[PDB]
Amino acid sequence: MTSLKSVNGQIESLISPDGSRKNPARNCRDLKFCHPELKSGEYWVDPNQGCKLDAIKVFCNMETGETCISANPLNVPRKHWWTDSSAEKKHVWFGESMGFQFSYGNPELPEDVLDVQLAFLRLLSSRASQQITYHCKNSIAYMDQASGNVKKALKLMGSGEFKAEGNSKFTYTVLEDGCTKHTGWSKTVFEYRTRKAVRLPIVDIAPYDIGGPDQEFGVDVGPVCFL
Amino acid sequence: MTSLKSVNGQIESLISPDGSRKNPARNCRDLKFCHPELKSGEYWVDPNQGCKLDAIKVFCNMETGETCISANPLNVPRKHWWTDSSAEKKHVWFGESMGFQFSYGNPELPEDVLDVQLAFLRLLSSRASQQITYHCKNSIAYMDQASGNVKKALKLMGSGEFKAEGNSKFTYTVLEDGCTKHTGWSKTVFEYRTRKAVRLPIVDIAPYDIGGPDQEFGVDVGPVCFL
Amino acid sequence: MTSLKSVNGQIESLISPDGSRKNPARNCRDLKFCHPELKSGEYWVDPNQGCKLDAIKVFCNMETGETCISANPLNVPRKHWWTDSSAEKKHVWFGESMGFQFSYGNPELPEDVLDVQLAFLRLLSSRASQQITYHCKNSIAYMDQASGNVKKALKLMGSGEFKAEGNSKFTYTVLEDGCTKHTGWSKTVFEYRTRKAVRLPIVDIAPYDIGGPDQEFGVDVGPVCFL
Ligand SMILES: [Ca+2]
Ligand SMILES: [Ca+2]
Numbered sequence: 001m002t003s004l005k006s007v008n009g010q011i012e013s014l015i016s017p018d019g020s021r022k023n024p025a026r027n028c029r030d031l032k033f034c035h036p037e038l039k040s041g042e043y044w045v046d047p048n049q050g051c052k053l054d055a056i057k058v059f060c061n062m063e064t065g066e067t068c069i070s071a072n073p074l075n076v077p078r079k080h081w082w083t084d085s086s087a088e089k090k091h092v093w094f095g096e097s098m099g100f101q102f103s104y105g106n107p108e109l110p111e112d113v114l115d116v117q118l119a120f121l122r123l124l125s126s127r128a129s130q131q132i133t134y135h136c137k138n139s140i141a142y143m144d145q146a147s148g149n150v151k152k153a154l155k156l157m158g159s160g161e162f163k164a165e166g167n168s169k170f171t172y173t174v175l176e177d178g179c180t181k182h183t184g185w186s187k188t189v190f191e192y193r194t195r196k197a198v199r200l201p202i203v204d205i206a207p208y209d210i211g212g213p214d215q216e217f218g219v220d221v222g223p224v225c226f227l
Numbered sequence: 228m229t230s231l232k233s234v235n236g237q238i239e240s241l242i243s244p245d246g247s248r249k250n251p252a253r254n255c256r257d258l259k260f261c262h263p264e265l266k267s268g269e270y271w272v273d274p275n276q277g278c279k280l281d282a283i284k285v286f287c288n289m290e291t292g293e294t295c296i297s298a299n300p301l302n303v304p305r306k307h308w309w310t311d312s313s314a315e316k317k318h319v320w321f322g323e324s325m326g327f328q329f330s331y332g333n334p335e336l337p338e339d340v341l342d343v344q345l346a347f348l349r350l351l352s353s354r355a356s357q358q359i360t361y362h363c364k365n366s367i368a369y370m371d372q373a374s375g376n377v378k379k380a381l382k383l384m385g386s387g388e389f390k391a392e393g394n395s396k397f398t399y400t401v402l403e404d405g406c407t408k409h410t411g412w413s414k415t416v417f418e419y420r421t422r423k424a425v426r427l428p429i430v431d432i433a434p435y436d437i438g439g440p441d442q443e444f445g446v447d448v449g450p451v452c453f454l
Numbered sequence: 455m456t457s458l459k460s461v462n463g464q465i466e467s468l469i470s471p472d473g474s475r476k477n478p479a480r481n482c483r484d485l486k487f488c489h490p491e492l493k494s495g496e497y498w499v500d501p502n503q504g505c506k507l508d509a510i511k512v513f514c515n516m517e518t519g520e521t522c523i524s525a526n527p528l529n530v531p532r533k534h535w536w537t538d539s540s541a542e543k544k545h546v547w548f549g550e551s552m553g554f555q556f557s558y559g560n561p562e563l564p565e566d567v568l569d570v571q572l573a574f575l576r577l578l579s580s581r582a583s584q585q586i587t588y589h590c591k592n593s594i595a596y597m598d599q600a601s602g603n604v605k606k607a608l609k610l611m612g613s614g615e616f617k618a619e620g621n622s623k624f625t626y627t628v629l630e631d632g633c634t635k636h637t638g639w640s641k642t643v644f645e646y647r648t649r650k651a652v653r654l655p656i657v658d659i660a661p662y663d664i665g666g667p668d669q670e671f672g673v674d675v676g677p678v679c680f681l
C-alpha cells in the first residue's frame with residue numbers, strides 16, 4: 001500500500017509539477033496557473049520540457065505570471081572605464097571593448113542548453129521586458145540638461161539596437177533620469193518591452209558620453225522577464 | 228486492486244490524451260494520430276502542453292488532421308457601415324474605424340494565454356488556411372463586372388496584408404464571387420493558405436468599395452485551420 | 455505486486471524515455487543528458503513530443519549531443535547529368551531540372567509530420583550543421599587550379615543560398631577540395647554551420663561547371679545535424 005501511495009503522489013507530480021529542482025514546470029505562468037496559491041519566489045522552471053534535469057532557477061512574479069531570469073553576472077562595477085582623448089565623444093560597446101557581454105541563467109549549464117531553454121521562452125512567450133540601470137558620475141545617460149537633448153543618450157544591443165530615438169518599435173523608454181547634469185554619481189533606469197520577445201535580452205551597452213577623466217560609471221543588469 | 232486499476236487508466240491517459248477538457252492532446256493531428264478512429268467533432272487540444280488547465284476548444288477535421296479555431300465573435304452583421312462622401316472610394320479598416328478586430332479561441336482565457344497557445348500552433352504547424360465570407364448588397368468584393376477588374380477588390384490583414392494582386396506569396400484566392408454586380412445582397416468567399424502559418428489568422432478586413440448610401444455589407448469569419 | 459512493478463517501470467520510462475521506438479526522447483542531447491552512458495547509435499527521438507507514435511529514427515552523436523538526420527535518399531549517383539552546349543557554363547539546379555530535391559527523415563511518415571518534427575528541431579536547436587560531398591570527373595567544385603578562383607564554385611539551397619563568396623553569414627566552407635583540376639573523378643566536401651538552424655537542411659545543389667561531354671558527377675548527402 002505504501003508503494004501505491006508513493007506512485008500516486010509521483011504521478012500527481014507528473015501531471016502538475018511543483019516548481020522544485022526535482023519537479024519543475026514549463027513557465028512561471030503555468031506554475032501560477034496550476035498552483036494559483038504559490039507566492040512569488042525562486043522556483044525551477046524547464047521551458048524545453050523533455051528531460052527534467054536541465055531546468056533553470058528563475059524568479060516567478062506570481063502576480064503577473066512573468067518568468068524572470070536574473071542575469072549573470074548581475075552588475076558591472078563603478079569605474080572610469082574609458083579614455084576621453086577625442087574632442088568628439090563616440091559610442092562604445094562595453095562588452096566589445098575594454099568589457100563583457102551579459103549572460104543569462106545558470107552558470108552550471110552549457111551554452112547550447114542555456115540557449116535553447118532561453119530560446120523557447122524567448123521565442124514562445126506573450127511578451128518580454130527588461131530593466132537596466134546606468135550608475136553615473138559626470139556622465140549623461142539620456143537627457144542632457146543643457147541641450148535638453150538625447151543626442152548623448154546611450155544604446156543597448158537587444159540582439160537589434162535599442163536607442164532613445166529612431167524607429168519607435170526599437171526605442172527604449174526611460175523610467176527615471178538622474179544622470180542629466182554633470183556635477184558630482186547618479187542613476188538612470190532604462191526599459192525595453194515588446195511582443196517580439198526574440199529581441200531580448202540585453203546583451204551589450206554603449207555609452208555615448210564616456211572616457212572623460214572626470215567621467216565614471218557602473219551598471220547593474222535587471223532580469224529579462226517573459227510573460 | 229481498485230486503486231491500481233484507477234492508476235493504470237490514469238497513466239494510460241497520460242501517455243495518450245483523449246481530447247477532453249480533462250485530458251487534452253497537442254494538436255488535432257496527434258489526437259488523429261493516436262486515436263485514428265475518433266470522428267471530427269469538438270475536441271480539447273493544448274498546444275503549449277505543460278499545464279493541462281489552459282487548453283482550447285477547437286474543431287478537429289479528423290480527416291485532414293487540421294486543427295480549426297472558430298473565431299470569436301464569429302460574424303459581423305449586415306449594415307451600411309460607412310460613409311460615401313468622397314467621389315473617390317478608398318479602403319477602410321473595419322476594425323480600425325467605425326469596427327472591431329477578430330479574436331480567436333476561448334473567451335475565458337487571458338490574452339497572454341490565448342496568444343501563446345495560438346503562437347505555438349501558428350509558429351509550429353505544417354501549414355495554415357482560413358476562409359472568410361463578405362456578404363454584400365450593391366458592393367463589389369473582388370471582381371467588378373463592368374471593368375472586369377479587381378481594382379475594387381478588398382484587403383485583409385493577415386498579421387502582413389492579403390490583396391487580390393501584388394506579390395504572389397501574399398495574394399488571397401477567391402472561392403466564389405457573388406458580389407460582382409451592383410444591383411439588389413450577395414456573398415463572396417476568400418481564402419488564404421500558406422506554409423508560413425505565422426501569417427495567419429485574419430484579424431482585420433478592408434473594403435475598397437464602401438459607404439454608398441446604397442451600399443451595405445456583413446461578414447462571417449471562418450476558423451483559422453492549422454495542419 | 456507484479457502489476458505494481460509493471461506500473462512503476464512504466465512510470466519511470468515516462469519521466470525519462472530511453473530512445474526506443476516505444477519510448478523516444480526529445481533530442482539526442484537530452485537522451486545524452488538523461489542517459490549519460492548511452493553510446494552513439496541509432497536512437498528514436500520525438501521533437502514535437504506529444505503523441506509518441508510519430509518519432510523519427512535519428513543518429514545520436516552522443517559525444518556532442520547532436521541529433522543527426524540521415525537524408526533520404528542518401529546519394530545521387532555518378533553520371534554526366536547535363537548538357538554542355540553553351541560556350542558559357544551556367545549554374546543549374548539538379549532538383550529543379552533534369553533531378554530531385556533532398557528529403558530528410560522517415561519515408562513512412564507524412565510530409566506534414568516530417569515537416570513539424572524537423573521544424574521544431576530546426577526552429578529550436580542551439581545550432582545546426584550539414585556536410586555534403588561532390589564527386590567529380592573533369593569538373594571544378596570550388597577552386598579552379600588554373601584561375602586560382604572560386605568563380606566556378608557551385609551553390610547550395612539552404613532554404614537561402616549558400617555560395618563560396620558573398621555575404622559571410624551565407625558562405626559555405628570547404629573541408630577538402632579534390633575537384634580543382636580537370637584531368638581524369640575526385641571528391642570535394644562542403645559544409646554549412648550556423649546558429650540560425652532555420653537555414654538548414656540543404657535541399658538543392660547547383661554546379662556551375664557542368665554538362666561537358668567530358669564532365670561527370672555524383673553526390674552523397676551527409677545528415678543535417680542539430681545541437
Ligand atoms: Ca529540459
Ligand atoms: Ca497548457
Ligand SMILES: [Ca+2]
Binds near residue numbers: 502504505507509
Ligand atoms: Ca510526436
